[PDB]
Amino acid sequence: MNIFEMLRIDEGLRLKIYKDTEGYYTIGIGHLLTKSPSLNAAKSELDKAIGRNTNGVITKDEAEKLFNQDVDAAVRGILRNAKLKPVYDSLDAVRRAALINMVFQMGETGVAGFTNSMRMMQQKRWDEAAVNLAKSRWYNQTPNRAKRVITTFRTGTWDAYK
Ligand SMILES: [Cl-]
Ligand SMILES: [Cl-]
């Protein structure tokens, strides 16, 4: 199991524009298109991204191309973030994939505000960090996905995912 397979499970795969859990236009493998309410704005953002007139539909190939770019952006975003980097560098391979999942779903930004968890993670206080991670909107809104990532941090295994 790896990051791609892991996010591919958490996000699903859709080829038609859709509303995510928050009602934002999304497509592919968790690719947020826009925060706005206009489907037009969504379509326009889609076409700009894909580089053709999609008419709100893409193929698998294109979903997968967005997915690659998004994972890559996430890694590079952690690495460039002063608060995340050190976190990421201290972790083992499984756990980094968990931090990358979070960053993917919520932005470097949303992630860096879990300071307390972050610091616990850096100290290797697994059970405590897991408890802290659970006191968040993130968990209350998407509890099953949050639990998988959380076990992941806690155990440093892929069990949540098998
Ligand atoms: Cl893009
Ligand atoms: Cl969920």
Side-chain angles (χ1 to χ4, degrees), residues 23-129:
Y24 299 136
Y25 286 131
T26 308
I27 198 157
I29 294 159
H31 186 81
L32 165 82
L33 288 154
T34 186
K35 298 182 178 165
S36 135
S38 226
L39 177 56
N40 292 295
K43 278 159 149 217
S44 163
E45 280 306 319
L46 174 59
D47 279 347
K48 167 149 68 85
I50 286 298
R52 98 205 169 32
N53 238 78
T54 69
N55 162 63
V57 176
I58 63 176
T59 67
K60 165 129 161 162
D61 251 273
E62 297 169 332
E64 274 160 14
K65 190 160 190 193
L66 299 181
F67 180 49
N68 279 326
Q69 295 164 171
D70 291 329
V71 168
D72 187 47
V75 179
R76 247 120 25 89
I78 277 160
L79 305 168
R80 339 217 213 53
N81 187 307
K83 270 156 81 50
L84 294 171
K85 190 167 183 275
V87 190
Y88 184 84
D89 283 349
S90 64
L91 294 173
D92 54 270
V94 187
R95 292 187 176 92
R96 292 187 167 159
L99 186 58
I100 295 160
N101 195 306
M102 293 179 75
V103 172
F104 184 99
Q105 188 193 345
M106 75 185 94
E108 244 179 59
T109 356
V111 182
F114 281 66
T115 297
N116 303 326
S117 298
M118 287 305 75
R119 121 238 158 225
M120 272 161 209
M121 263 159 2
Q122 247 156 319
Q123 319 178 76
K124 314 216 168 253
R125 295 182 166 43
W126 316 124
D127 279 53
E128 324 180 352

